[PDB]
Amino acid sequence: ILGGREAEAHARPYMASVQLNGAHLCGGVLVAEQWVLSAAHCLEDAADGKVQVLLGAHSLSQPEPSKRLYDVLRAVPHPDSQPDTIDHDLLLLQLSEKATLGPAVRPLPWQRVDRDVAPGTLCDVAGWGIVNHAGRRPDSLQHVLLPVLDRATCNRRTHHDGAITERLMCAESNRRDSCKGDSGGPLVCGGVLEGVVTSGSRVCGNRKKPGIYTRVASYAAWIDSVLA
Numbered sequence: 376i377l378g379g380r381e382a383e384a385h386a387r388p389y390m391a392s393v394q395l396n397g398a399h400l401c402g403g404v405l406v407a408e409q410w411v412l413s414a415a416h417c418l419e420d421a422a423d424g425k426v427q428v429l430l431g432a433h434s435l436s437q438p439e440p441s442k443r444l445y446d447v448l449r450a451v452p453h454p455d456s457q458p459d460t461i462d463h464d465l466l467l468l469q470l471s472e473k474a475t476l477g478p479a480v481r482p483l484p485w486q487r488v489d490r491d492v493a494p495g496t497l498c499d500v501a502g503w504g505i506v507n508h509a510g511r512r513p514d515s516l517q518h519v520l521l522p523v524l525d526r527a528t529c530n531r532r533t534h535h536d537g538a539i540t541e542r543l544m545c546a547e548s549n550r551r552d553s554c555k556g557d558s559g560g561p562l563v564c565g566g567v568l569e570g571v572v573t574s575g576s577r578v579c580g581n582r583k584k585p586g587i588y589t590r591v592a593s594y595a596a597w598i599d600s601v602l603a
């Protein structure tokens with residue numbers, strides 16, 4: 376998260392760190408007792424690494440009573456996701472067991488009704504991704520409020536050039552932005568999960584290249600079907 380602030384410890388009890396070989400790789404969101412939603416691009420290149428999900432965390436390194444590391448039983452990428460596109464970039468991770476629910480570990484309800492978030496609406500984005508242009512990685516969870524950008528402006532030639540489908544939304548990226556290591560984490564509007572961070576492009580914090588988020592409501596039938 377560029378241009379954000381440290382979050383309040385455990386105020387986002389849905390927040391998950393998706394880990395490869397003991398290190399934070401991607402954000403994720405606890406959406407049911409046994410399932411975490413993240414981005415499909417995260418698991419390309421996992422190949423024989425230890426894939427785990429850290430729940431109940433604030434600091435990645437320091438000990439905390441609520442922190443617990445879970446193994447993944449099953450990972451289900453959306454079947455139309457591909458490494459060279461930004462489309463359908465969702466991943467569902469089934470934990471080895473039901474997560475232990477508590478003040479610091481709780482699922483976040485997600486939008487099932489396919490309606491665009493209105494432009495200008497401020498949405499909360501959180502993660503352990505990099506926090507500046509010198510590559511600094513934070514120890515503790517960061518967050519930022521970003522205004523939703525309307526799809527037609529997002530789709531102009533100077534911005535993302537028709538790439539933003541009805542299944543994607545954008546937010547302003549002017550010095551405040553999701554960045555490397557925030558992928559798969561939550562965009563929350565009205566207290567509900569509306570988006571999952573994705574990227575087509577390496578650039579962060581450039582007004583001309585808005586952040587892109589996969590609209591979970593757009594995949595509501597697929598999500599339900601995998602959760603059953």
Ligand SMILES: CC(C)CC(=O)Nc1cccc(-c2cccc(CN)c2)c1
Pocket residue numbers: 400401416417548552553554555556557558572573574576577578579580585586587
């Ligand atoms: C960590 C893997 C999923 C590989 C990957 O995609 N890396 C990578 C590198 C630089 C910027 C970003 C990136 C992420 C989230 C948002 C944005 C821009 N808003 C950029 C992403």
